[PDB]
Design a protein around this ligand. Structure first.
Ligand SMILES: OC[C@H]1O[C@H](Oc2c[nH]c3ccc(Br)c(Cl)c23)[C@@H](O)[C@@H](O)[C@@H]1O
Ligand SMILES: OC[C@H]1O[C@H](Oc2c[nH]c3ccc(Br)c(Cl)c23)[C@@H](O)[C@@H](O)[C@@H]1O
Ligand SMILES: [Ca+2]
Ligand SMILES: [Ca+2]
Ligand SMILES: [Mn+2]
Ligand SMILES: [Mn+2]
Lengths: 227, 229
């Protein structure tokens, strides 16, 4: 058995178990991935590599992460681009900004990205986003074009409680988002061992483009178990 | 409802609803995929594209195929490489030979291959095959390294009756082989709609490598039903 777990109830100014990229930084109880400014990207990774699957045994990890995030849009109707929770190679680095959310580079499947992300997408990108043009939760596998999405009403400035669980027996990745004032779930079968390397880093990403909003994380826990 | 169905109880020398690739051809009322010769490949596809899933609806077809095959190994202990029933893009062509069975090119997941195969694998390839080194039935998804396998004792020269069924309610692919030891069954979830295009061709592949055997099919039926709701 190999397990990794952590809990951050409130971020500190020197959150040394996080790796920051782009504009990500911790400040005043919060993890800020971006401020409400154009054309930016912020990411933060958990410091330790996580052992998500093993090939000798072929086993995959069960894991769960929960976190509370806030999107603060100065202009409530012009919100972009969103935020994600992601699983990527250990040396992951920010990818394209804007509608690509800092985690992918194309709406086509790219095996070299080796990334699974759960996106909370505030801006309709016509080339790939769901044609109903709603903001949406999505599950992304090596592409910005989600393999499954669920429409989602953003509550500007409200705390969103997210739980993301992966069941290694069924390859099922479940997402839930809850506001204090409304609940959304979304699941899909994800063959993690075919997507991400055996070791990964996990983290958050958020971006802005021509439209913008602040993206913040208030707390984060994670637990994986690999038999 | 969109359905594709066909039955061939015995192959004819001019089987025009099959597309042949490599060494495949029909003779003496059988489909021959390879003769007992080294380093070859032979495939046969049903002619018509088959509508296996639909994006607008998200629906996946239920389907069942059943066929009888024979492996005739001149050398009973040195058998290779095996045979498959496969689902692939409409323009599918033979892929790597030998232990790759003419359907895959790697033991790592390859999205672009877009192929599901059910393998009847007679030769232990150390780089990916089950480490007990048994001959084995396998379910292969974009890789020659099966997502799931079941040890299978080959009966040389004997007719093997195969049924492959896909339950679209559960995305469960089930394989059964029966020799009329005597029966083997293997199941796994296959997310077809993530792997193959909406339109597919189905067919058989067989290969030999440094070791060899004849791989033959004696009959084939298929039926898929894709719901429109
Ligand atoms: O922030 C939302 C969007 O901003 C940009 O797209 C544009 C939306 N309106 C525009 C107007 C002009 C120009 Br130039 C651009 Cl790139 C855009 C791009 O960065 C997109 O990737 C992003 O989704
Ligand atoms: O037909 C069975 C096998 O034949 C070849 O592997 C070998 C089996 N015995 C050998 C002996 C020598 C050499 Br060189 C090779 Cl490549 C082989 C290769 O073509 C394998 O891919 C295949 O599974
Ligand atoms: Ca978007
Ligand atoms: Ca083999
Ligand atoms: Mn999206
Ligand atoms: Mn095999």
């Amino acid at each position: 058995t190999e397990t990794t777990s952590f809990l951050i109830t409130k971020f500190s100014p020197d959150q040394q178990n996080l790796i920051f990229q782009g504009d990500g930084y911790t400040t005043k109880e919060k993890l800020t991935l971006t401020k409400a400014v154009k054309n930016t990207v912020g990411r933060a990774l958990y410091s330790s590599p996580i052992h998500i699957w093993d090939r000798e045994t072929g086993n995959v990890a069960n894991f769960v992460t929960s976190f509370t995030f806030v999107i603060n849009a100065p202009n409530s109707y012009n919100v972009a681009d969103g935020f994600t929770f992601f699983i990527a190679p250990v040396d992951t680095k920010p990818q394209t900004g804007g509608g690509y959310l800092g985690v992918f580079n194309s709406a086509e499947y790219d095996k070299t990205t080796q990334t699974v992300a759960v996106e909370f997408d505030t801006f309709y990108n016509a080339a790939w986003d769901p044609s109903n043009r709603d903001r949406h939760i999505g599950i992304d596998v090596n592409s910005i074009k989600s393999v499954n999405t669920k429409s989602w009403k953003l509550q500007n400035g409200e705390e969103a409680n997210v739980v993301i669980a992966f069941n290694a027996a069924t390859n099922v990745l479940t997402v839930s988002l809850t506001y204090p004032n409304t609940s959304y779930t979304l699941s899909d079968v994800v063959s993690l061992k075919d997507v991400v390397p055996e070791w990964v880093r996990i983290g958050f990403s958020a971006t802005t483009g021509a439209e913008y909003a602040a993206h913040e994380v208030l707390s984060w826990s994670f637990h994986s178990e690999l038999s």
